[PDB]
RNA sequence: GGGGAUGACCCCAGGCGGUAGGGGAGCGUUCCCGAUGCCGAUGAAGGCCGACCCGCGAGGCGGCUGGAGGUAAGGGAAGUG
RNA sequence: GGUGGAGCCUGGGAGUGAGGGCGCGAGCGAUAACGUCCGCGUCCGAGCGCGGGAACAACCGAGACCGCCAGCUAAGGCCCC
RNA sequence: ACCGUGAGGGAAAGGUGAAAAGAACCCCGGGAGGGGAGUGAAAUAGAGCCUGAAACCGUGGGCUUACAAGCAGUCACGGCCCCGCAAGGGGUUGUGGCGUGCCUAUUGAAGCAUGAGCCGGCGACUCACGGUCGUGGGCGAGCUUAAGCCGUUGAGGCGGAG
């Protein structure tokens, strides 16, 4: 009939504890603050699971605009010439190269530029 | 190397502390000449501490004078729960807290 | 020895260095196979060409390993008395870099 | 079929319909559970440790909260009611039913009824070499009348008789040899 | 739903935010079986730490601790989380 | 009837039995109130968690099984932050 | 033990070791207490002396710290430090992005409404008899009392008012 929980709660309150990095001064052993820290801490970095992505969506966005608007030209033109296209669309890596080799990227630039007027 | 160490001390954690703090990581001989000379309280029990520690030392763990504090801290331990007044009802106590001395002597 | 090709999505810009890649549970299980996967960015040996003037030709690289979620934990929460929890998922199989 | 007659290179007998048939599980245990569970017993926590004392719930307004439940070493809270029937008696055509089936489990040894007689353990000892094995580790004791004195007492002892015995007996995965009258106990099934 | 060998595999349909709350399914916890079950002084348990398993509640496992246990591959029981 | 997937009866197990917010049609009310009263749609429900309108449940778009370094659009925006 | 005048209330405190062999002597010291030596299987087993975890205070190190907001953080990247599961991770963070705790009860909740200062152990839908619907299963007529007898284990069997 004894129903000694013991080691068993220690034992998930240290579980919880290594949850606990070692963040905050404090929560860094508040054995429930830590846990509550914790629930914030996760809720959170899922939240940020998928948010990630798009911050991306930018930073290319940007290393991209250095290179189109170098050259001469907004994405809106970009863009669109780009999407004349037919054979190739590809955004993601582009300035990536833009930077990584000037001359690829020029050339893209080109065929691009062109794309359009 | 060998060491200096009390419990059951009745003083200071603290106060204790700042003893020590400043005779620290010096001298053998000169901080002796800091327990000596300086103020405050557990002064005394510290310089005691050290006076044990070096016997101690070229005692039985071996070249005198090249001997100077390596390390030194307390640690508080044992309480004295002492009981006064109720709250004109309720105790209220407060605890003298006992001290542990604890103090490194390492030749040069 | 690099070049930017892409595959069931991006995964793009690799050589040799084998770039763990997707699940694609149809051809992989092939242990050490060749796979041809279509260009579409000839930067080589400093000279670059359009991504479809390549759409025609491309690589294969060899089928190499299985990698298996590498951990990753999301605790599923929300004050509105909402607990759930599991761990990743993502797997996939490694492919060293095959060039022609 | 079957049926083999001990004294070894003596006879054969017949196995019956009745332990012959096919088998009921679910009934089985159920036997089993009837019978550790008429047989258990009871426990309890302390009706006056648990509401004896005089308990003062200390008013209100001053900075607290309030014999009762929940502070520490007494209450309980719903314990081993000593107050709680520990009987469980399944049911006569149940029970009988199951020491039933579960036997014909058993068939899956025949004591011929010249044994009722031999009177020393090591006589057993004796018979043992007649037929050792680790089934014979099983080993269950039936006798059909009044026990196969000695018998009843070795690194195995018990001893049924051709009438009381049953799946508690031995259903319980084990393997045996019951004297003839204790076929009787077929009778009776 | 289309076959399923026990898995499982495949197609699509087909969604899958969720409190009161209603239905399924698992997890470890100290006990009674040792359903032709027993490990351990070259460690029982609990402790102390960890970039293999589980969706998970948990597992395993390796290291150091500490002195004596106690597990149960399966069902039963409950002062259980 | 294009539909597809709710529909009906029998029975066990339920919760809440007092919300409010908006648009619209009435009351009342100084056509006064993030007032209330009923009504017709939705909304919100401690997660109808993301976008935005600054920030703002909650009003316009929107249904969130899970994939950080993909792509097309809502509403809403594109001199700068 | 103790507050109560009184009637009355009513704690908390078990474990070292195999057995003391419990710690001569030497060492600093007013001493306790600390160091040696001896037991010894260990004494970071040492006398409130098994296993003695958390809270919390200390002592050494890595990193980090003076134009800066926030619990939190977490997504990115960089610098420096360790590579007992090495060309990948470990810890720490400068910057930068986005980001209102947790629980009750609420039309509605950061909450400035409540709840709670820290950690460890206690702690709350059960039992019994009824009845009920579900079902697993034994016969369809199905079924059992009180008892009598049988009992390492101690074995169930027989009882036919209802």
């Given at each position: 009939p004894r129903a000694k929980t013991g080691i068993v709660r220690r034992r998930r309150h240290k579980k919880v504890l290594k949850r606990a990095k070692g963040f905050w001064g404090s929560r860094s052993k508040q054995y429930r603050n830590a846990f509550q820290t914790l629930l914030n801490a996760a809720t959170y970095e899922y939240r940020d699971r998928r948010n990630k992505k798009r911050d991306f969506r930018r930073l290319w966005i940007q290393r991209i605009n250095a290179g189109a608007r170098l050259h001469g030209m907004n994405y809106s033109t970009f863009i669109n010439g780009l999407k004349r296209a037919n054979i190739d669309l590809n955004r993601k890596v582009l300035a990536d190269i833009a930077a990584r080799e000037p001359e690829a990227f020029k050339a893209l630039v080109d065929a691009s530029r062109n794309a359009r007027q | 190397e060998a060491k200096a160490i009390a419990r059951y001390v009745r003083i200071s954690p603290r106060k204790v502390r700042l003893v020590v703090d400043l005779i620290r990581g010096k001298s053998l001989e000169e901080a002796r000449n800091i327990l000596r000379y300086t103020n405050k309280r557990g002064a005394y029990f510290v310089a005691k501490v050290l006076e044990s520690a070096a016997a101690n030392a070229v005692n039985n763990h071996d070249l005198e004078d090249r001997l100077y504090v390596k390390a030194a801290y307390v640690?508080?331990?044992?309480?004295?729960?002492?009981?006064?007044?109720?709250?004109?009802?309720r105790a209220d106590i407060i605890k003298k807290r006992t001290s542990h001395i604890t103090v490194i002597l390492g030749e040069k | 020895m690099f070049a930017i090709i892409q595959t069931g999505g991006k995964q793009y810009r690799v050589s040799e260095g084998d770039?763990?890649?997707?699940?694609?549970?149809?051809?992989?299980?092939?242990?050490?196979?060749?796979?041809?996967?279509?260009?579409?960015?000839?930067?080589?040996?400093?000279?670059?060409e359009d991504a479809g003037?390549?759409?025609?030709?491309?690589?294969?690289?060899?089928?190499?390993?299985?990698?298996?979620?590498?951990?990753?934990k999301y605790k599923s929460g929300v004050q509105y008395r909402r607990r759930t929890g599991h761990r990743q998922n993502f797997t996939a199989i490694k492919i060293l870099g095959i060039q022609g | 079929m079957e049926a083999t007659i001990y004294d070894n290179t003596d006879g054969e007998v017949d196995l019956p319909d009745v332990f012959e048939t096919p088998v009921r599980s679910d009934l089985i245990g159920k036997a089993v559970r009837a019978a550790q569970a008429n047989r258990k017993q009871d426990y309890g926590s302390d009706e006056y440790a648990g509401l004896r004392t005089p308990a003062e719930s200390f008013g209100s307004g001053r900075g607290?909260?309030?014999?009762?439940?929940?502070?520490?070493?007494?209450?309980?809270?719903?314990?081993?009611?000593?107050?709680?029937?520990?009987?469980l008696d399944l049911n006569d055509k149940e029970r009988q039913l199951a020491v039933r089936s579960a036997l014909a489990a058993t068939a899956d040894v025949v004591v011929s009824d010249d044994f009722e007689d031999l009177v020393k353990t090591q006589e057993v000892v004796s018979l043992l070499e007649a037929l050792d094995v680790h089934a014979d580790?099983?080993?269950?004791?039936?006798?059909?009348?009044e026990p196969?004195?000695?018998?009843?007492?070795?690194?195995?002892?018990?001893?049924?008789?051709?009438?009381?015995?049953?799946?508690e007996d031995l259903a319980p995965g084990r393997l045996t040899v019951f004297t003839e009258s204790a076929l009787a106990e077929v009778a009776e099934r």
């Open positions: - | 640690d508080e331990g044992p309480a004295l729960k002492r009981v006064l007044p109720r709250a004109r009802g | 770039v763990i890649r997707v699940e694609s549970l149809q051809g992989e299980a092939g242990d050490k196979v060749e796979l041809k996967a279509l260009f579409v960015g000839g930067e080589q040996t400093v000279f670059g003037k390549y759409t025609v030709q491309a690589e294969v690289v060899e089928h190499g390993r299985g990698k298996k979620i590498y951990i990753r | 607290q909260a309030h014999r009762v439940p929940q502070a520490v070493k007494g209450r309980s809270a719903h314990p081993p009611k000593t107050e709680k029937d520990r009987s580790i099983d080993r269950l004791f039936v006798t059909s009348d196969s004195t000695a018998a009843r007492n070795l690194a195995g002892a018990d001893v049924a008789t051709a009438s009381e015995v049953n799946t």
